[PDB]
Amino acid sequence: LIEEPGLTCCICREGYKFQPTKVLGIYTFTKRVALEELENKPRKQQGYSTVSHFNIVHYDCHLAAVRLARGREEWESAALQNANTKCNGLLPVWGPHVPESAFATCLARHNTYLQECTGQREPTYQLNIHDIKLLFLRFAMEQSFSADTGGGGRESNIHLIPYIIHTVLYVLNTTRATSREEKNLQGFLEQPKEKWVESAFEVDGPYYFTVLALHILPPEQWRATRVEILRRLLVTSQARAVAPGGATRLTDKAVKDYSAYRSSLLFWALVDLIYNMFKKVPTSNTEGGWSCSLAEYIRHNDMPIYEAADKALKTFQEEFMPVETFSEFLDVAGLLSEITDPESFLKDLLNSVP
Amino acid sequence: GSMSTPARRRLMRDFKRLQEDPPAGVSGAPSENNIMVWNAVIFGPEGTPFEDGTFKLTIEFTEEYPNKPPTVRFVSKMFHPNVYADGSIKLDILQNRWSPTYDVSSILTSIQSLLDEPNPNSPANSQAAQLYQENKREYEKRVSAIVEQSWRD
Amino acid sequence: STPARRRLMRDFKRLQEDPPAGVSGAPSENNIMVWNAVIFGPEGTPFEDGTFKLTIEFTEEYPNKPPTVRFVSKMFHPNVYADGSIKLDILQNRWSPTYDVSSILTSIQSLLDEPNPNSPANSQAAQLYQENKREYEKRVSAIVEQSWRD
Ligand SMILES: [Zn+2]
Numbered sequence: 324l325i326e327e328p329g330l331t332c333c334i335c336r337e338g339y340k341f342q343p344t345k346v347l348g349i350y351t352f353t354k355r356v357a358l359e360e361l362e363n364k365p366r367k368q369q370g371y372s373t374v375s376h377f378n379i380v381h382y383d384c385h386l387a388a389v390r391l392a393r394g395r396e397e398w399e400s401a402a403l404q405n406a407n408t409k410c411n412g413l414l415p416v417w418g419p420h421v422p423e424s425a426f427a428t429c430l431a432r433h434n435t436y437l438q439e440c441t442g443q444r445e446p447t448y449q450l451n452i453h454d455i456k457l458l459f460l461r462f463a464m465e466q467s468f469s470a471d472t473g474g475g476g477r478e479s480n481i482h483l484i485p486y487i488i489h490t491v492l493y494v495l496n497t498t499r500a501t502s503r504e505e506k507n508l509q510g511f512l513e514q515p516k517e518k519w520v521e522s523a524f525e526v527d528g529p530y531y532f533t534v535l536a537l538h539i540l541p542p543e544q545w546r547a548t549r550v551e552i553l554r555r556l557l558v559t560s561q562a563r564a565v566a567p568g569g570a571t572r573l574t575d576k577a578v579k580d581y582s583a584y585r586s587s588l589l590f591w592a593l594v595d596l597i598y599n600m601f602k603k604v605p606t607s608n609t610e611g612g613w614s615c616s617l618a619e620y621i622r623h624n625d626m627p628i629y630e631a632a633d634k635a636l637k638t639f640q641e642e643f644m645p646v647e648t649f650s651e652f653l654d655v656a657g658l659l660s661e662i663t664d665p666e667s668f669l670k671d672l673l674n675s676v677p
Numbered sequence: 678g679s680m681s682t683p684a685r686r687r688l689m690r691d692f693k694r695l696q697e698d699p700p701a702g703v704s705g706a707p708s709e710n711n712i713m714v715w716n717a718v719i720f721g722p723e724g725t726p727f728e729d730g731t732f733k734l735t736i737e738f739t740e741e742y743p744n745k746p747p748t749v750r751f752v753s754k755m756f757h758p759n760v761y762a763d764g765s766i767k768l769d770i771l772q773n774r775w776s777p778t779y780d781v782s783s784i785l786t787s788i789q790s791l792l793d794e795p796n797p798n799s800p801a802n803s804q805a806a807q808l809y810q811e812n813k814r815e816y817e818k819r820v821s822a823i824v825e826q827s828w829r830d
Numbered sequence: 831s832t833p834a835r836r837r838l839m840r841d842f843k844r845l846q847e848d849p850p851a852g853v854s855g856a857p858s859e860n861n862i863m864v865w866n867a868v869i870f871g872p873e874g875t876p877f878e879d880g881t882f883k884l885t886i887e888f889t890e891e892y893p894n895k896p897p898t899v900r901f902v903s904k905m906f907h908p909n910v911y912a913d914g915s916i917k918l919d920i921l922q923n924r925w926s927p928t929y930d931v932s933s934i935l936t937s938i939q940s941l942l943d944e945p946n947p948n949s950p951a952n953s954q955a956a957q958l959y960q961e962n963k964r965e966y967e968k969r970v971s972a973i974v975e976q977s978w979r980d
Contacts, residue, residue, distance in 0.1 A: 679831070680832075681832040681890040683891070
């Protein structure tokens with residue numbers, strides 16, 4: 324009868340308003356890549372990086388279409404309902420009135436899909452955090468999203484973020500692994516400045532722990548850690564620039580061109596804009612910390628998040644990408660209220676690290 | 678008719694979509710009793726020799742809908758390079774390239790636009806494919822014969 | 831009337847004419863697709879003296895697809911998630927259209943007596959059921975008492 328406001332399966336045209344217990348899924352495409360390219364090891368540590376055109380299907384409607392279509396591959400079959408852009412996974416989303424028994428069954432099905440195309444048996448949430456990290460880096464480094472699929476760019480993958488984040492929040496909440504990563508994250512922040520050069524070439528470097536902080540730190544805790552993380556991201560850029568292979572101490576501590584810091588600054592901006600999308604999330608005191616409060620917000624607000632994602636992409640695409648100087652970055656990021664000396668803040672930071 | 682199955686529930690959705698926002702030139706509806714059989718008319722678009730034609734066709738669904746495409750055939754007499762001799766339509770969207778996201782409205786527009794710009798390199802009617810590229814006068818003359826024949830029903 | 835609703839009427843009959851001991855369910859006064867059932871804790875088990883109330887959500891795909899069986903009273907059980915949903919083979923993978931509301935409610939109270947920690951849903955509960963039986967029945971008793979409020 325009526326149309327469905329929120330997410331709608333493109334096969335049956337129905338969503339939660341008529342099937343509030345049917346799991347919705349996002350067609351994704353994941354491939355086996357290296358976690359960190361600057362890892363000084365010969366054989367890079369392996370993970371996976373995923374992209375999406377953000378096409379929605381019920382998990383039953385996907386199986387019904389590929390089962391009745393015998394003679395062709397399951398994922399060659401799903402490409403027709405995925406705007407002819409090839410795919411190999413179906414990321415499940417957990418609706419408000421969807422039973423946890425149904426979502427956990429679909430997440431295991433998606434994990435098996437990841438085991439096949441990426442070869443990574445047992446896809447942990449740590450590997451999934453790196454998957455968000457690599458997806459963030461595709462935004463910040465202006466990399467291609469349609470290179471392996473055939474369609475979809477920043478517009479498509481900016482809406483994949485909250486649900487790719489959700490699977491990390493779900494594993495962090497059921498397995499009670501929040502406090503372990505909380506103490507593990509605080510160890511990264513408390514790293515002395517001698518380790519900063521060495522961490523810019525490690526797998527679980529400053530990029531990974533930034534994505535992790537997004538999952539376990541409230542917005543108030545982020546604003547306090549914004550500058551400290553910004554320092555570690557800036558030193559990461561200089562380390563990877565003056566010594567693209569490996570380094571333990573900063574030799575060339577002189578400020579370089581803005582093109583050397585642009586990747587880390589857009590990475591920082593993309594994370595901050597996502598925190599702005601979730602500025603309305605209840606802080607705590609609700610049967611869980613941040614990873615619980617955020618997971619329930621993502622669960623119940625599919626449409627508020629969609630508009631916030633397009634609003635965040637608009638700010639990233641129109642205001643952050645055209646930035647040419649580090650002083651202009653602090654203007655757009657809004658850090659001038661707490662970083663009063665932009666010229667000295669950089670050169671002092673590169674001098675503060677051995 | 679209950680409309681309990683997945684199909685029918687979708688066919689009702691395709692009905693309300695084709696009813697409250699029908700494309701220009703086409704109009705369809707299910708049978709009064711069996712929803713698995715639809716009747717649709719496709720008017721010949723202007724700028725083409727099919728203009729002023731009331732071409733009728735029937736669509737037959739199964740309970741596999743929308744996973745499997747429906748069998749569409751022209752009831753009115755048709756002379757087109759991409760239409761077989763029994764009303765069957767040699768179109769990829771209706772056969773191998775069928776997407777479960779396509780509805781009845783998207784099927785009628787694909788057939789409507791197929792009359793305007795045929796696909797002669799992949800022919801279903803050998804006689805109409807050769808006339809569309811060689812003698813444009815005889816092609817638009819034979820099509821005008823089925824335009825008058827579309828009035829005979 | 832649809833095939834799923836007429837089948838749901840038959841489920842109500844066999845649950846009112848031959849109601850198995852320890853359970854009692856009925857549809858809502860307005861919606862036939864939403865049922866509410868009570869499962870009294872089996873005697874001789876840690877769930878004794880418990881009045882656990884459930885909800886059963888059906889769709890027009892019934893009885894070909896299993897319903898959404900969910901607990902409302904809080905439950906500390908290895909095969910029961912935090913939101914009330916149950917990890918049970920007959921409710922997910924091994925579902926058969928020959929089952930009904932009674933066969934489900936009976937298979938649920940049987941699971942309270944015989945859990946399946948091999949494929950668990952509450953890891954903290956499945957760990958206590960096999961390692962520390964004394965503590966497992968200590969938290970289950972707290973869930974029994976908790977099922978008495980509203
Ligand atoms: Zn669907």
